[PDB]
Design a protein around this ligand. Sequence first.
Ligand code: FMN
Ligand code: FMN
Ligand code: FMN
Ligand code: FMN
Ligand code: FMN
Lengths: 318, 316, 311, 318, 311
Amino acid sequence: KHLEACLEGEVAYQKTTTGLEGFRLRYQALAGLALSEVDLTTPFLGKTLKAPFLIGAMTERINLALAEAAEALGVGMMLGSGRILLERPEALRSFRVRKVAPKALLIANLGLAQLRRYGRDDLLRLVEMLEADALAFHVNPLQEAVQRGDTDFRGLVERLAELLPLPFPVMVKEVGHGLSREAALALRDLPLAAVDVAGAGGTSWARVEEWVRFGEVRHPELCEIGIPTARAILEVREVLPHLPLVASGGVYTGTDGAKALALGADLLAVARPLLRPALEGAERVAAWIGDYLEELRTALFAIGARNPKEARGRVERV
Amino acid sequence: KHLEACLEGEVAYQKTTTGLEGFRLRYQALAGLALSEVDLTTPFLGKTLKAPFLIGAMTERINLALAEAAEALGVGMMLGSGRILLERPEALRRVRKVAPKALLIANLGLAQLRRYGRDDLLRLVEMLEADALAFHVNPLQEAVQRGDTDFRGLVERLAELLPLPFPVMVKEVGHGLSREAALALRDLPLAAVDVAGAGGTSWARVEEWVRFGEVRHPELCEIGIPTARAILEVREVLPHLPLVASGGVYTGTDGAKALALGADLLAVARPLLRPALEGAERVAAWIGDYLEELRTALFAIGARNPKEARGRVERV
Amino acid sequence: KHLEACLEGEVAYQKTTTGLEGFRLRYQALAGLALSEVDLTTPFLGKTLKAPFLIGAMTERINLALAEAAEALGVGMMLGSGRILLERPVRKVAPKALLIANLGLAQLRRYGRDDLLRLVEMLEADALAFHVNPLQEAVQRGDTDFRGLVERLAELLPLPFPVMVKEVGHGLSREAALALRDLPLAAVDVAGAGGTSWARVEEWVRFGEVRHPELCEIGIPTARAILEVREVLPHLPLVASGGVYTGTDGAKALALGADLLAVARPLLRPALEGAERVAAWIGDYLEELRTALFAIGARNPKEARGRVERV
Amino acid sequence: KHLEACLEGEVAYQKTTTGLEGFRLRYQALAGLALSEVDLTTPFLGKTLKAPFLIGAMTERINLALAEAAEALGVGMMLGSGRILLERPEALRSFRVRKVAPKALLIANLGLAQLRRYGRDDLLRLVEMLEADALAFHVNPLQEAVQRGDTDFRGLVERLAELLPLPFPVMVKEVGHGLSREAALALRDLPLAAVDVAGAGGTSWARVEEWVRFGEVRHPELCEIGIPTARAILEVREVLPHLPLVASGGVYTGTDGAKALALGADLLAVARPLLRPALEGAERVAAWIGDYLEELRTALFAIGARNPKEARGRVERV
Amino acid sequence: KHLEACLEGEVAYQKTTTGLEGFRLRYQALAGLALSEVDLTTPFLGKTLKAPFLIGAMTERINLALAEAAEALGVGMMLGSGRILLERPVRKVAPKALLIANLGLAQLRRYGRDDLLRLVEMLEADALAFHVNPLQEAVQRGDTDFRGLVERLAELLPLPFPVMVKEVGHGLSREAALALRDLPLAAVDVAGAGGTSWARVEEWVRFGEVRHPELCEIGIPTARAILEVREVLPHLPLVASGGVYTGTDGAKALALGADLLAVARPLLRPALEGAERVAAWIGDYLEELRTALFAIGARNPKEARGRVERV
Ligand SMILES: Cc1cc2nc3c(=O)[nH]c(=O)nc-3n(C[C@H](O)[C@H](O)[C@H](O)COP(=O)(O)O)c2cc1C
Ligand SMILES: Cc1cc2nc3c(=O)[nH]c(=O)nc-3n(C[C@H](O)[C@H](O)[C@H](O)COP(=O)(O)O)c2cc1C
Ligand SMILES: Cc1cc2nc3c(=O)[nH]c(=O)nc-3n(C[C@H](O)[C@H](O)[C@H](O)COP(=O)(O)O)c2cc1C
Ligand SMILES: Cc1cc2nc3c(=O)[nH]c(=O)nc-3n(C[C@H](O)[C@H](O)[C@H](O)COP(=O)(O)O)c2cc1C
Ligand SMILES: Cc1cc2nc3c(=O)[nH]c(=O)nc-3n(C[C@H](O)[C@H](O)[C@H](O)COP(=O)(O)O)c2cc1C
């Protein structure tokens, strides 16, 4: 159903935008460097990816096409909520993807609200079964409100905070509505491995949720609520000046990814746009991502940056 | 192919603009002067042009129509990359024949200094009988085109073998020169600079259009410094070097704004491409009309010449 | 690539239409019957389908989703050109379901009597369908020779399994139907213009856009094709396909002289999402075809014949 | 719900039209008559109405506003399905409208499919309770199909045919999808008092029905099925050359009513367009209808017709 | 100026169309032939062209680009009014190519037998074409006297080289064809409405805009002109021109009764870019005309006749 909606409905934001359009990249006609010298290699969560890119979390045959491409290109990949795996270890055969992705970095996904019913061990089991290199918890009160699902988000930050110091790197992310600066403050003390701001502008899960319930978005404005990806990057970075940040949420082009990095991001993550190419097969997914990085490179090149790092600051507000 | 695209495709910028629309000219109803007294005469690169205008660089029969008009009106003209001439001296069939007096800036493009030197340059300005030489930088274009993508140490390779017999200038091809780009040139003894900013023709678009018959990465091709921003930024860094505003400065009124923001010369390329295909008379008509309005604009502004235009504009 | 284009490009016809819009169904407010009494059961190619519907030919994991649904609902299914199978040697999910193997006429120039039997064999198909498509092949720039294919079939015809001829969306004219009148075919698929234009799909694959629009709109509108072909082959069972995307349209198709409806492209996306989605699509289509036949006053696909008028 | 949909949804036909636009009225600049001499008086179902107009059937406080206006202007009125009254005689107090409409002609409404569960007496009781001057049965297989209600319309024409010869005049009508010529044939033998073709072009009850189920019309083409009001008039008249016919189904203006009459109708009936003015009160309803007849008169006047009858034939196909 | 207008103004017809859209080509999915066997070779005015195509008359450097392409592909070419040549006295690039000299009827009022021979002479043309255009001349406000021009030609006719009459885009009516039925012409160019409207081109030159739109839409649609003229001159070779801008349209043109297609304005811009560009344009046009004839079931421009129906 949710997969159906993302593929057939108007689930993207209609009024709010990532805000990246409000910034222009500083073009250096005389930055004097060679395109061949711009290196996208970037180490993330204890592994060296060939580009600062992560396939976004998506929730069976799609995962094998996504992963296969992740390996082929050398980029990371966040798995869909393995929440269903801790409930049916028999269903493990379908998230089994290491087979196609031997080396590729794989972030397992679970979602904070679950720490209210799962603990220390269960977690280890999940990262285990999947043979993941890390684990990501996603928070999403607005989505859950509109969906009318577990609507209780009390004391989840501490329940994590305590049982934290885990064997594998851990990161927190939203699902497209964004993480505010105060949200970043609430995480500043936990020893996280990284953060995914996943802001507004791309796919609105409040819309995806309503579309699943009515076959149309009945409360448009309610579903546009969120922190634009651009604002989220700036705000979160502002609070966590050193933790590696992932910009996701409508960062659908290489040029935009460059802007994302310039504003303070370290990694880019794309989800919905890969959903269709994933249905067509790994080759198609690899093609999509390949082209995205091909332009991210050219963008960094025109900016005068030799790598995702030197992009920082190379942008100005329109 | 490139000539085809500029003539048949959507090669102009779609979202980014020159930004000149963000400024209004300060109309002086009582500046108390006569239209007849506004003089466009302006000396550039060691020659006195009748108007602060340069026909933009364009790359065979078109050049003879452009030049012929350049003479007729007394404006300059930048030649297309004569890069092909240093490779096939036979095919040097030259426009001086139609343009005896007219100021002609030869064109070559920086990335070439990686394979050509001191002499070769002199030969080019020579063969053409040009009054100067212009090197153009364009990493973004070359990236999208997928051509020579190496721009390392080109500024110095020029810097050293610089002090040349003829005046030299650096220009972009429509994506613009940033203030830092102007900084990287501040030390070289250049004769002038052409900021050639975004807003007019996007060569990234022209390039993609040549490869797919359509622009596949629109946003990627809109990357650049708007002509208005480039004028302000570059002037800011090189307060005295003569500057050429080009890149979507398609009307006289816009040229006036360009000057007001800190430019000394205006340059137009693509818009002249079609009239050039129709003949010199048509090209002369176009440019004539442009200057006719530039004059009226300077007149309404209260400026007697391209110089007094400086500052006579405000941000909307 | 072709699968990519159908899923991402403007491959549907832009100017020519099926023409079904030119006809209105004769609504009988007092036909006096019960919706429950309208039966879609229809026997085709030696099997009894639960509705006069066939999943259109489409060319790997999609086929298993399409077939699984074909079984679930009791409708037929045409397989993609098994041409690739005779060069590099789904029943598992579809035990009972009627399956028409597909090959394409131009191949009889390089394959014969046996090879055919082998194909229907390997697939465990209930019949075999040859598709003709000169316009597509022209634009594609593929095998462009269609000489003597009708006879090469005509002779080696009388085959162990029922055989049918079809186009790929540009339609079969009345003269085309004449050229087939003598062959002992099991059925025909007019596959007319109005839905997906394979000339467009073909050009889109070559330029990422349709460069010769008008050239790709060439064809016989599905409505015209039904009328024309029926006119020539008054009894051979006919399949209406080519932009017959709704139940209401299917009803019109039948009313004009069709016996079966076939849908292709519209099922391509639901096929990528899985059998449940495909079954949902088709289920809904038949749900409306039934209501349409109901309002028309027809108790079955047959009584629909003639229950329509030109607007 | 149904009342909600007609008031808030796109329940009118989207592609099919009444078809009246395909005819132009024959304007007689020199028909040489006085506007004052065109008389709308027309006797229907044993009563003399002041204009060939009937308020369409609509299904509580609205009925009192509609009726009150019916009296005020001297036009008829068809009541909503009193089907609910034969099931809850206690609910009679709400259809009780004779109090406001002492004289006005009132056609009770019931709907054919009910003769499968009600008989001779029950009918008399309904016309009785309401103190109606006649009874109208409505057929609507397409609506019922889409609604998913009683979908069995077998032998309803005869069940009526036999127990017919009733104490009060009886008429058959559709609900907006129209009656075909064959439909008219199936009625040619029954001794009906009149017929309401109620064709397509105005409100599509298939759309109203789907809108109630999904909050949107999911099968547009399916809901456009029907006989355009113009076609229905011609076709039915063709079969029943003398039975008085009512043209309804998108005949929303006086000028259109004139066209309706010209094509062979005797009475015009309007429903949905009166629904909102009915919610505002009798005065508003009277205003609407008053204005409609004011233009019908002018139209008949320009046509050269002194009354609804002389309108017959005064129109041509564009 | 006129060259400027055609290149920069809205000189095409705005309301009237060629009318070719009113016909659909009869697609023969089973015409059973090979694309390779459709031959465009067609002999015209005493020469064998490789395709039934003629570059339209256009009026200096453009002509060398057009001609050079004419040779390259093997198609004909009509020269601009050489009227200016008989007042102030391209084969070099086009040695073999068929070249129709152009002059225009209204000139026979001031030029005679010899002068004509001189023109065809100087140009080394293979024939001569006179163009009539009262509507253009009216709007232009030029020589507006067209009296007795048909006879002045009629008499001094029987000329050493083949002669043909044409309009300039407003078309030749059936009666116009009647007035020519007696003269021994080599061929006719109906040059109908639907493409470039010279009344518009003319007004655009005078006001920089079309002030009397409806006045400039006056004319016989190319489709009607083909039918009407053919009707009167069942055997004289006919050229369809006037908005016949695509191969598919050319096919329709032929099907309705034309023998040759001629394109003008659409070649004007590629002509400004050079012969290669012009050749590309025409090459692509014939490439589709071939495919169209192929789908129609026609082996050559002749078998196309009648292979079309009215929509
Ligand atoms: C089909 C689909 C499934 C998803 N499943 C998950 C999931 O299981 N867990 C999660 O944390 N996010 C999930 N997401 C969210 C993305 O990882 C993330 O919210 C992103 O911001 C939305 O993609 P973006 O805007 O490019 O489109 C899913 C998104 C899509 C489209
Ligand atoms: C047909 C055409 C050919 C050109 N050729 C050259 C060239 O050889 N070298 C160069 O440095 N710029 C060339 N240019 C670029 C212009 O000189 C310059 O980039 C300008 O900013 C684009 O024109 P503008 O925006 O008015 O249109 C060419 C532009 C056009 C339209
Ligand atoms: C992805 C796709 C694959 C197809 N593959 C074949 C094929 O292998 N053989 C064939 O004869 N037709 C094939 N078709 C054509 C259809 O069977 C048929 O031409 C139909 O008329 C097009 O579907 P329709 O108009 O509903 O959409 C294919 C169509 C689609 C969309
Ligand atoms: C709120 C509403 C309630 C209705 N109730 C009935 C009803 O009970 N019985 C009936 O036979 N028709 C009913 N109708 C139908 C009308 O009498 C008739 O179908 C008409 O053709 C629709 O109105 P028209 O097209 O102007 O809008 C109802 C229509 C509306 C808008
Ligand atoms: C630039 C241009 C110049 C032309 N010059 C002539 C001419 O000298 N004599 C003539 O008879 N027709 C001339 N024509 C007309 C064409 O030969 C003919 O009228 C044709 O129908 C218009 O081209 P078509 O509709 O494809 O565009 C000219 C057309 C154009 C566009």
